Structure 1
Amino acid sequence: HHMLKLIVETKTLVQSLGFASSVVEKRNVIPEYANIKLSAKDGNLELSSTNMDLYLSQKIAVQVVSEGECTVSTKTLNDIVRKLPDSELTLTDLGTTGLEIKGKNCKFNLFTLPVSSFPAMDSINPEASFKISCTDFAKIIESTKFSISLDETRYNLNGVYLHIKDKEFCSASTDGHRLSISWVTLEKQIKNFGVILPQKSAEEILKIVKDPKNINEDIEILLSSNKIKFICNENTSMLSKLIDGTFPDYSTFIPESSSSKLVINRKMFADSIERIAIITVEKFRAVKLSLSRETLEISAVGEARGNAKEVINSSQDKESFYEYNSDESLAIGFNPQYLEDVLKAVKSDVVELYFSDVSAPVLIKFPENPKDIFVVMPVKV
């Protein structure tokens, strides 16, 4: 009966198909069989994309000529729409002919798959529900997604721990070797609750909130024991399953005391670590920080490759800033990637590193970023 027909701005459809494709990508590949549901109703086109773990619904304004729904291959629709030059396209369900995608000079017919086979979005019964700005949400995921464990066998670490703590919404991640924590203050008291969001879901919702149409708006977060739902700026909803696991108590992992402090230009430090780390081998990814008031020497060795050293001098100039406030020298080793991950996560002129002994973790903080904390365990050098 109801046959979909709409006219849509091509660039807007391309953007929505990009998110619909990304959310079901299981490697760098859209599954050949993945389908997208297209629902034209009430001035809008709703695009739905889902797999076993995730459900994404997007609504975009279109010219709805006839109400209706159909489903087609996600990858094929994505591939075609990105190669049409027209500023607008017409989409028409022609029944046995398929879904017609029509520009000025060209027509594609995509065989449809029945809507009756397409899953509806699950319901959610939220334990907690609240809204924060998309800027604040992007920050806490940006600051924590890099230190999730990529080891699938460490189930409770293959995601970010999203949890409410008093009036603070926090994301924490750890992989056994480092800890990242980032939070935002909530305006209302909510029941303390905590869930582990899978890596892929965290990556996808981050890209959604960072979209220029969303980054200056708000995201609603609905938490339950088995599901989490994100409603980003009204018109995009993502539902995710949760990782069945218990996030470690990271409480005692944060150093309460330190005996020395490094303040250093962030880019200078990051670029030097990167350079010096080149000579290392996978069997021993480590750089040595030989810290003193006058100089920092960053050095490394690579078995059967060579060695490397860069010297950073004390400086009060912003672009080369280096200060280390101790009469005692400290030589402490770190996996360079763990330091680089943190340094890349926060855009700050300088970074602060708080140390104790050679066997204790470093606590890393950025000025003007009071709600981000990073802890990294050393390695023997």
Structure 2
Amino acid sequence: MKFTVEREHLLKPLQQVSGPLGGRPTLPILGNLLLQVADGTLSLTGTDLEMEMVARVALVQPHEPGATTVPARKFFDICRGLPEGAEIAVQLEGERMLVRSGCSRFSLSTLPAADFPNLDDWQSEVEFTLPQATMKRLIEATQFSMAHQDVRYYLNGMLFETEGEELRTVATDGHRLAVCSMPIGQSLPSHSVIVPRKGVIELMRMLDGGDNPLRVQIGSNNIRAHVGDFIFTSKLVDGRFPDYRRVLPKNPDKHLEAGSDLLKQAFARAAILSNEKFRGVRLYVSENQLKITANNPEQEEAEECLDVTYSGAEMEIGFNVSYVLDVLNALKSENVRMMLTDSVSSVQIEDAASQSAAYVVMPMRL
């Protein structure tokens, strides 16, 4: 196996395929990248057994077929450490991989390509394409609401749902929920899958928002995303995900609109004097007026008053201010709308200008 490529044709591929890796995998070959030269293509693959990233780079310079695996970190550091525009010549020689560039020479230990974990083939059941920027928005809008290491393993991930011609993401940790929907101009079957948290993050980081459209293939137990020269595959999470339709408040009859920044900064200050563990704040609403209060076990107190647009009856409600801040931070709109019902019901929050994304936060007794 032999190839010569320009540094800059190798760096991003190396970075992408290293994604699924960790510093020190127990099974050592998982710390390595699979390199394959076939025809006019160099393929690079990294895996953690649950998901895999593949990158293909065209070989315009002389090359010879073959395969081996090399330490990902070392090989990436070498390439990144070389000067901009450097030509990187690689040859397999025994069980060492030789790397030459300019007046620099490196000899890396290898592990047999034959030892590299091969993810089973599977069949695509549902397929569609959409702009990268769209997928990116769908994930960004909801990702923060995913559970982390919950015993409810099905919550440590994101629901990807197809219905009509919409793709929809849903994330919840059992306390707060995020949903975002985008039309993608194709008739789809109704289908739902749970992508694991680490897979969601990997997919997110593979998208640069560019001109290459994202092609998605969903099987019964896997999902694959193809964009440009990168191919990402992840296993799916089993289990039944909550129904976001059941969580959305029914006919909220109270509507608040306010500047997003002003509102966020008020909650952020009030949070300072909220209980450090439970983060409870109170919201008082009345005609065109909003008051936020916070206190803590030290009997310190914060009060924020704000001019808003509010029509319905007066009410107060408590909730976890971190959940509200997460929402306001994710919105990235100028104006925010909150739909309320009463003090024992959830609140729905959205960008005032779009219903694409919706957020649900529970009430909390303070």
- The interval holding the TM-score normalised by the smaller chain is over 0.9
Identify the residue that residue 268 of structure 2 maps to in structure 1.
274
2-structure distance, mates of 1:239, 1:94: 28
Q: Does 1:286 align with 2:280?
A: yes
Of residues 220, 234, 237 in structure 2, which corresponds to 1:225?
A: 220
How many residue pairs get aligned? The number is 362
Distance 1:31 1:268, change over 3 A: farther
Distance 1:146 1:181, change over 3 A: same
Give 1:80-159 correspondences, 5 Å limit: 80-96=78-94, 98-159=96-157
Q: Does 1:370 align with 2:355?
A: yes
Distance 1:86 1:252, change over 3 A: closer
Give 3-state SS (helix, strand or coil) of 1:194's partner. strand
Identify the residue that residue 45 of structure 1 maps to in structure 2.
42
Does the CA contact (< 8 Å) of 1:86 and 1:103 recur in 2? Answer: no
- What are the ranges of 5 or more consecutive residues in structure 2 without an aligned counterpart? none
Task: Provide the aligned C-alpha RMSD in A.
Answer: 1.9
Give 1:136-215 correspondences, 5 Å limit: 136-209=134-207, 211=208, 214-215=209-210
Distance 1:373 1:86, change over 3 A: closer
Give 3-state SS (helix, strand or coil) of 1:120's partner. coil
Aligned letter for 2:354?
N
Distance 1:97 1:179, change over 3 A: closer
2-structure distance, mates of 1:102, 1:344: 47
**Greater CA drift, 118-127 or 258-267:** 118-127
Aligned letter for 2:50?
D
Identify the residue that residue 364 of structure 2 maps to in structure 1.
379
TM-score (norm 1): 0.89
Identify the residue that residue 14 of structure 1 maps to in structure 2.
11
Aligned letter for 2:148?
L
Does the CA contact (< 8 Å) of 1:264 and 1:352 recur in 2? Answer: yes
Distance 1:254 1:97, change over 3 A: closer
Identity, in percent, stands at: 29
Deviation at 1:161, TM superposition (A): 0.8
2-structure distance, mates of 1:376, 1:248: 15
- What are the ranges of 5 or more consecutive residues in structure 1 without an aligned counterpart? 315-321
Does the CA contact (< 8 Å) of 1:290 and 1:331 recur in 2? Answer: yes
1:72-92 Cα offsets, whole Å, 9 max, x none, are 011111222222224223131
Identify the residue that residue 244 of structure 1 maps to in structure 2.
238
Deviation at 1:121, TM superposition (A): 4.3
2-structure distance, mates of 1:218, 1:127: 20
Deviation at 1:184, TM superposition (A): 1.8
Of residues 301, 305, 309 in structure 2, which corresponds to 1:323?
A: 309
Identify the residue that residue 346 of structure 2 maps to in structure 1.
361
2-structure distance, mates of 1:311, 1:66: 69
Instruction: Report the structure, 1 or 2, having the larger strand content.
Output: 2
1-structure distance, mates of 2:327, 2:358: 10
Deviation at 1:379, TM superposition (A): 1.0
Aligned letter for 1:45?
L
Deviation at 1:334, TM superposition (A): 1.6
1:330-379 Cα offsets, whole Å, 9 max, x none, are 22122112112211222211010000101101111113433211111111
Give 3-state SS (helix, strand or coil) of 2:238's partner. coil
Aligned letter for 1:161?
L
Aligned letter for 2:47?
T
TM-score (norm 2): 0.92
Does the CA contact (< 8 Å) of 2:49 and 2:119 recur in 1? Answer: no
Give 3-state SS (helix, strand or coil) of 1:281's partner. coil
Of residues 287, 297, 303 in structure 2, which corresponds to 1:303?
A: 297
Distance 1:42 1:298, change over 3 A: farther
Deviation at 1:105, TM superposition (A): 2.1
Give 3-state SS (helix, strand or coil) of 2:189's partner. coil
